[PDB]
Ligand binder design. Structure first.
Ligand SMILES: [Fe+3]
Ligand SMILES: [Fe+3]
Ligand SMILES: [Fe+3]
Ligand SMILES: [Fe+3]
Ligand SMILES: [Fe+3]
Ligand SMILES: [Fe+3]
Ligand SMILES: [Fe+3]
Ligand SMILES: [Fe+3]
Ligand SMILES: [Fe+3]
Ligand SMILES: [Fe+3]
Ligand SMILES: [Fe+3]
Ligand SMILES: [Fe+3]
Ligand SMILES: [Fe+3]
Ligand SMILES: [Fe+3]
Ligand SMILES: [Fe+3]
Lengths: 119, 118, 120, 120
């Protein structure tokens, strides 16, 4: 296939709080705001468009997952395990304080939108 | 030292199988793969949608980039009774080019082109 | 990596003959003219921008990935049109296709003499 | 029944090794592969550039789509490295990026390149 996912809208309680937190943690530039969206651009020709929503939001095992460097993981995990960010090895948030080693890589789930970083 | 990528996202829909089959069918993608509670669709830019059964409101949507030729083909099929709108808020029942529509679960989608010089 | 090839400019003796011929054979819509270029858009988020300037030294070539069904169609049109074709990038094996590497391939000329390839 | 894709194109340059290593380094790609007379660079959208020795004429170029963060990184090193650049494909606006965003410059072999963004 050639079709690409170009952008996807993510509903969260506070779009500005979500986007800046993720850009900071992921080491990305300041998010750009356009209309009702806070835009987080990723490297693979895709952006996440955060939008304010009062309702549900995210339920496990739902999540958004970011593929990163293992050098990036050790830094991001350090800040997670520095700034007191609750985290889990699993998408169901049943294993707090652990990382997984799924594909011989490393991975961790965190944050109220559900996130995942993986190598 | 790679730059950060969005690798996959889980999308909650009333019917993950209806959603996945319609999306793979319409976009020309291979048959969805079943993995745990998810129906998984792979896109070309190293990112996956994982549909999961649950219970979208506009202007939420997921948007797929295609060539103009694929846009004309897919929209030709959308020869079809699929409701469609030019805008993410579904107030204009097309607008590069783009068009918005719903899948059988009510999940909001968009197809769009980005031609040279766009 | 995530970096994509978004467009590339291809030098040909006649940009509109090359673009029109290639769009027709490949089953694509009529090429669009943009600035100094005749544009051939392909499906994988990349376009070929033909420009007047040959443009090619063998084994130089531009290669298109296509369906098995479309390969049979296009190659039939290649023989139906009397278009010269070769199994190899060096144009040393005229009149045949190859079946290398789990697929099929054939090399041919556009009207500018530019070296082309279709492959499955 | 896939739609037609551009799978690879071979690029004539003065030095295939200089061009390919330069391009992979700057774009953050893996080490180029050597295959016959070619140095092969794979891009993410299912297309490869195959560099070949030939011992660029504006406005021809190959254009690379990257994120805004990757653009600022690559251009900063272009700025720190004195590589010389232009805002335009005809190279009439030197020392400037354009505004997505774009910047044009050459590689060691003189191959014409471009990095570009297309943000939401
Ligand atoms: Fe704001
Ligand atoms: Fe999410
Ligand atoms: Fe995941
Ligand atoms: Fe390092
Ligand atoms: Fe990737
Ligand atoms: Fe969606
Ligand atoms: Fe959209
Ligand atoms: Fe793309
Ligand atoms: Fe060529
Ligand atoms: Fe080839
Ligand atoms: Fe066949
Ligand atoms: Fe068929
Ligand atoms: Fe492909
Ligand atoms: Fe080039
Ligand atoms: Fe360009």
């Amino acid at each position: 296939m050639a079709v690409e996912l170009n952008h996807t809208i993510v509903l969260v309680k506070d779009k500005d709080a979500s986007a800046t937190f993720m850009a900071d943690l992921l080491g990305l530039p300041k998010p750009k705001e356009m209309g009702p969206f806070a835009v987080l651009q990723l490297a693979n020709d895709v952006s996440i468009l955060f939008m304010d929503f009062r309702g549900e939001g995210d339920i496990v095992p739902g999540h958004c997952a970011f593929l990163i460097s293992d050098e990036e993981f050790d830094q991001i995990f350090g800040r997670i395990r520095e700034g007191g960010i609750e985290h889990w090895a699993d998408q169901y948030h049943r294993e707090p304080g652990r990382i997984n080693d799924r594909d011989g890589g490393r991975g961790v789930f965190f944050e109220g939108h559900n996130m995942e970083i993986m190598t």
